[PDB]
Amino acid sequence: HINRTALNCNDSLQTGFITSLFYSSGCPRPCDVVSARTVCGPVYCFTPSPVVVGTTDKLGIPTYNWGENETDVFMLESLRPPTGGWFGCTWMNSTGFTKTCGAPPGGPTDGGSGPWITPRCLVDYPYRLWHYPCTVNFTLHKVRMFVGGIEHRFDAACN
């Protein structure tokens, strides 16, 4: 189940961002399909709660090539809520840059691009501080809500 994580990590600027994958001062695009050869690390798509996306092909068959074959892709469109709620996904590209995808913010009350449910809050997930180092001092709040019928328990990181 570990092969399903893309590992095209190209630390070209000598920043050491790949290290925390094994074990801070400087502090939209539509989620369709991304090529795994540009991804380094886990891909978290944000339904009301966070979910892990693994390397698959175009049909959706899971691949176990660490995201190296050019046919490897991430089907972010297939993870969308059918009821049409807010949606977004984040990941890290080969050179240590956090990438986001989601719906354009229709207003200040609407959601952001990544895990930004609010322009102030952020969905907590195991790799939040790796993709977003500046949110370390954010406060966590436990959240319960019904979206499209499903219950969703998750934590949000706000100022």
């Epitope: 893309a6 590992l7 990590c9 070209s12 790949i18 094994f22």
Partner: antibody, heavy 119, light 107 residues
């Protein structure tokens, strides 16, 4: 600042050596092994990354070396060409990953270990 | 990939500047080059990593530069300790080493 390795050994041709590597909190992502014949430069014996369980080896060594994990390295079918000093390296920061390996600069070297193949 | 160092031996006096050259047979893509020194009867010490960046604890007189096929290690002022063998290493592809460069006292 030098990692502890197993003592020097003399082995007959065709035998097998097992050299160890001892960590000194400690952080490292892989186990490397660099060897140097008497009067030669550095050669890269294989690597082994424990978090992913994958490993690479060189063409000359592919048929008789494995590296596992304190880390260990074993050579079989020894010939006189394998007379060399063998260092283990546990580097800290990976720079280039490409599924399912990660390449970086050798960081924390061991003291070394002499292996002499002589009957 | 093949790393060719030049020259085989470098002959300088204490205080002069050393410039060692490492030339790759193929481009090192995103520069993943390292420099090591080996004193007689000692384990190698990492001097320079990632082309230009200096390793922690390494004195400021050591400097690395270069990109593509041609890389360079520079010792601005040679101290008595620096006279040793220096290896350049590429970790962009399968790890490879170049043959050393001996730095001895000129006379």
């Amino acid at each position: 600042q030098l990692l502890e390795q197993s003592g020097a050994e003399v082995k007959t041709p065709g035998s097998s050596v097992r050299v160890s590597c001892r960590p000194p909190n400690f952080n490292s992502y892989s186990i490397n092994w660099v060897r140097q014949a008497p009067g030669h430069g550095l050669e890269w014996v294989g690597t082994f990354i424990p978090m992913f369980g994958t490993s690479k080896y060189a063409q000359k060594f592919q048929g008789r070396v494995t590296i596992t994990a304190t880390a260990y390295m074993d050579l079989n079918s020894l010939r006189s060409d394998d007379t060399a000093f063998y260092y283990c390296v546990r580097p800290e920061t990976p720079r280039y990953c490409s599924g399912g390996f990660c390449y970086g600069e050798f960081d924390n070297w061991g003291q070394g270990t002499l292996v002499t193949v002589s009957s | 990939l093949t790393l060719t160092q030049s020259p085989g031996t470098l002959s300088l006096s204490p205080g002069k500047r050393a410039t060692l050259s490492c030339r790759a047979s193929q481009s090192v893509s995103g520069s993943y080059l390292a420099w090591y020194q080996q004193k007689p009867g000692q384990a190698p010490r990492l001097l320079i990593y990632g082309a230009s960046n200096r390793a922690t604890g390494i004195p400021h007189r050591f400097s690395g530069s270069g990109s593509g096929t041609d890389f360079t290690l520079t010792i601005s002022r040679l101290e008595p300790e620096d006279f040793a063998v220096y290896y350049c290493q590429q970790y962009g592809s399968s790890p490879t080493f170049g043959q050393g460069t001996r730095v001895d006292i000129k006379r």
